[PDB]
Every structure is written in structure tokens, then in C-alpha cells.
Design an enzyme around this catalytic site. Structure first.
Site, PDB file in Angstrom:
ATOM      1  N   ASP A   1       0.892  -1.161   0.000  1.00 36.94           N
ATOM      2  CA  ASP A   1       0.000   0.000   0.000  1.00 36.94           C
ATOM      3  C   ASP A   1       0.933   1.213   0.000  1.00 36.94           C
ATOM      4  O   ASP A   1       2.159   1.059   0.035  1.00 36.94           O
ATOM      5  CB  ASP A   1      -0.850  -0.031   1.282  1.00 36.94           C
TER       6      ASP A   1
ATOM      7  N   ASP B   1      -7.966  -5.320  14.147  1.00 32.58           N
ATOM      8  CA  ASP B   1      -7.608  -6.408  15.045  1.00 32.58           C
ATOM      9  C   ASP B   1      -8.375  -6.377  16.350  1.00 32.58           C
ATOM     10  O   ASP B   1      -8.811  -7.416  16.827  1.00 32.58           O
ATOM     11  CB  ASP B   1      -6.086  -6.515  15.245  1.00 32.58           C
TER      12      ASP B   1
ATOM     13  N   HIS C   1      -6.389  -1.488   3.578  1.00 31.95           N
ATOM     14  CA  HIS C   1      -5.388  -2.326   2.928  1.00 31.95           C
ATOM     15  C   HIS C   1      -5.658  -3.805   3.216  1.00 31.95           C
ATOM     16  O   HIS C   1      -5.657  -4.629   2.299  1.00 31.95           O
ATOM     17  CB  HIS C   1      -3.982  -1.952   3.382  1.00 31.95           C
TER      18      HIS C   1
ATOM     19  N   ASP D   1       7.314  -5.975   9.258  1.00 27.36           N
ATOM     20  CA  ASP D   1       8.283  -5.785  10.323  1.00 27.36           C
ATOM     21  C   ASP D   1       8.455  -7.051  11.162  1.00 27.36           C
ATOM     22  O   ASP D   1       8.890  -6.983  12.308  1.00 27.36           O
ATOM     23  CB  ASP D   1       7.901  -4.592  11.205  1.00 27.36           C
TER      24      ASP D   1
END
Ligand code: MMC
EC number: 2.4.1.101
Length: 330
Positions: free
Chosen positions: A40, A187, A86, A109
Site C-alpha cells: 500500500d 484487530d 489495505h 516488520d
């Protein structure tokens, strides 16, 4: 053996290189684990980095780079709206356009453990067979070195707390979530009962992902041949009988006795909490994560948080009369 794609969520960090290098180094087969990198943001340097891998991965680009209209309480959170958009786009690509049956979702990450692929290959059949599970995660929320048993890299658990941070889901779950996907904070939205519907995830004693660039979680480095092990103990019926009997069959110790390392002959103990205040206090005293999402503690299962403390196995547990989570425990 089954084909399971790895969906990498990327944006504007050139260090997606480290994430991809580790995934590619440990991947056992390109055919069994195709890697799809959804980028993105349109960050040029990051796009060039991903493109340089060529056919080793498939590079897809989120199409709508426009700013999103946020609600009145969210002026400071545009980034979270973009992340949610996204994820919705990338998961739709994996499940609709590529038509894969499941996917392991990872952020750019994260660094993987040597047995990351072996772990998902072994647990995918459990997820397919047990409707009470809705994911398999590589993350132990209380996975710092001093809190995990390095002699048990193969040990797995069930958890009611969706950990994310490297997680496997079925196309069938995306079919259920997609129609009501949230505008932001995806989440924590999955952690609400209206989404979770009492379902659990499998999680490990030692994490199979670690963040870089949460920082204290230990990455497993001893390869475990999960596909050669008998993982039937994770089936709901066996787990809820045996693991619970184990927890409640263990001797109870006052939290201060555990904190000071009293009665060391007891290698596995239970510390009982009775209300939200005692849970928070006891978790803090033993160095366990104390925050709750929709009333569920990190790594909790039927309210029980299991971890190692000064070499001893500890179960921070409610009374066995426990019967559901209260979202008001904030
Ligand atoms: C897991 Hg990148």
C-alpha cells in the site's frame, strides 16, 4: 502437504527486505508457500526493493491511495483507516483473485523462526477440522525469554485472545468477516465477541515470529518437526478436558509466594484471581501482560494465562466456575 500462501502486508519501510529475506531463506518450497507481497502507500523505494526479488514473490499494489473520511472521534487516526482498507483489499485479492483456500498473514516488520513454515503446515489440518478454532498464530503474547520454557519448543496451546502477528486463516473465515469489515482498528474489532464467537487460536510456547525496527518476545531458534508430531491434544474436546484438569489439579499458591519463589518443589502451580482488580494486580506482580480486549487477557484461555516464572509453570486462573468473558473488564 498443502499449498499455503504467505501474504506480506507492506507499505513504506524499505526494511520489508529483512522480512522477505528470512521468509525466502526458510521457505521449504516455492510451490507449497507462494509469497504475495501486497504494498500500500506507493512508496517508490519500497516498491523497487520488492520488485528486485523478481519471480521469488508476487508484488501486488493496493489501488486506492486516497485519504479516507474519518468519523468525528478519529481525526488522529487516518493511518488506522488506511491499514483497515489495505487488509480488506489484500485479503480479498488472496481469496477472490488468487482463490487460495487459506493464507498466513504477516506484516513487513516481522522476522520468522526456522520452523515457521513447518509450524503452519502442521497446524493447518487442525484449523480445517476444528470449527472451534478460527486461526493459528505464531505469537505468544507473554513470550519473553524468562517466561517461556526453552526445553519445550514443541509445546502448543489454545488461546481465546487473537494474537495476530503471523496468523493463518481459512477462506471460509474471510467469507464471514468481509461483509462487515470495519473502517478502522481491525484487530481489536476481531477481538470483540460479535466477531470471535467464542473461537480460539492455536499459539506456541515459543514465538515463531518476532518484530524488528513486543520487542522483547523471544524468537524460537530450535527447529521443531511439527509435521511429525501428534497434535491431537489441541482438539477442543481433549484440550478442554486435559489442560483444564491440569490447571485445576495443580496446587494453589498465593501470588506473593510465587513472586518470592517459595515452595520451589512445586514445579507447576495455580495463582487464582477473583475479580478484575485482582487479575490486574496479580498479572502485574508476576510480569504478565495485564491489558484486556473485550474482557479477554493476553494469551488467555477460559480466563487462564499460562507462563513460566523463575523456571516454574504458573497458571493465573479464575475459579473453575468460570463461564465466559465479561467485556466490562477493561
Ligand atoms: C514474516 Hg515477514
Amino acid at each position: 502437504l498443502a499449498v499455503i500462501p504467505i501474504l506480506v502486508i507492506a507499505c513504506d519501510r524499505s526494511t520489508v527486505r529483512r522480512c522477505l529475506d528470512k521468509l525466502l531463506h526458510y521457505r521449504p518450497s516455492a510451490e507449497l508457500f507462494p509469497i504475495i507481497v501486497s504494498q500500500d502507500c506507493g512508496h517508490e523505494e519500497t516498491a523497487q526493493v520488492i520488485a528486485s526479488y523478481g519471480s521469488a514473490v508476487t508484488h501486488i499494489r493496493q489501488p486506492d491511495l486516497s485519504n479516507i473520511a474519518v468519523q468525528p472521534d478519529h481525526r488522529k487516526f487516518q493511518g488506522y483507516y488506511k491499514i483497515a482498507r489495505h487488509y480488506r483489499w489484500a485479503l480479498g485479492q488472496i481469496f477472490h483473485n488468487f482463490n487460495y483456500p487459506a493464507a498466513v498473514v504477516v506484516e513487513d516488520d516481522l522476522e520468522v523462526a526456522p520452523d515457521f513454515f513447518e509450524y503452519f503446515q502442521a497446524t493447518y489440518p487442525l484449523l480445517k477440522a476444528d470449527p472451534s478454532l478460527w486461526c493459528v498464530s505464531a505469537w505468544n503474547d507473554n513470550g519473553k525469554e524468562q517466561m517461556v520454557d526453552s526445553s519445550k519448543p514443541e509445546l502448543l496451546y489454545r488461546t481465546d485472545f487473537f494474537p495476530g502477528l503471523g496468523w493463518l486463516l481459512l477462506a471460509e473465515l474471510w467469507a464471514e468477516l468481509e461483509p462487515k469489515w470495519p473502517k478502522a482498528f481491525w484487530d481489536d474489532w476481531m477481538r470483540r465477541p460479535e466477531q470471535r464467537k467464542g473461537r480460539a487460536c492455536v499459539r506456541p510456547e515459543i514465538s515463531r515470529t518476532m518484530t524488528f525496527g513486543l520487542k522483547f518476545i523471544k524468537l524460537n531458534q530450535q527447529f521443531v518437526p511439527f509435521t511429525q508430531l501428534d497434535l491431537s491434544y489441541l482438539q477442543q474436546e481433549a484440550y478442554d478436558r486435559d489442560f483444564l484438569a491440569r490447571v485445576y489439579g495443580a496446587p494453589q499458591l498465593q501470588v506473593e509466594k510465587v513472586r518470592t519463589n517459595d515452595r520451589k518443589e512445586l514445579g507447576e502451580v495455580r495463582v487464582q484471581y477473583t475479580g478484575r482488580d485482582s487479575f490486574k494486580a496479580f498479572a502485574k506482580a508476576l510480569g504478565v501482560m495485564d491489558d484486556l480486549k473485550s474482557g479477554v487477557p493476553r494469551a488467555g484461555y477460559r480466563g487462564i494465562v499460562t507462563f513460566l516464572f523463575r523456571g516454574r509453570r504458573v497458571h493465573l486462573a479464575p475459579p473453575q466456575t468460570w463461564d465466559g468473558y465479561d467485556p466490562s473488564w477493561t
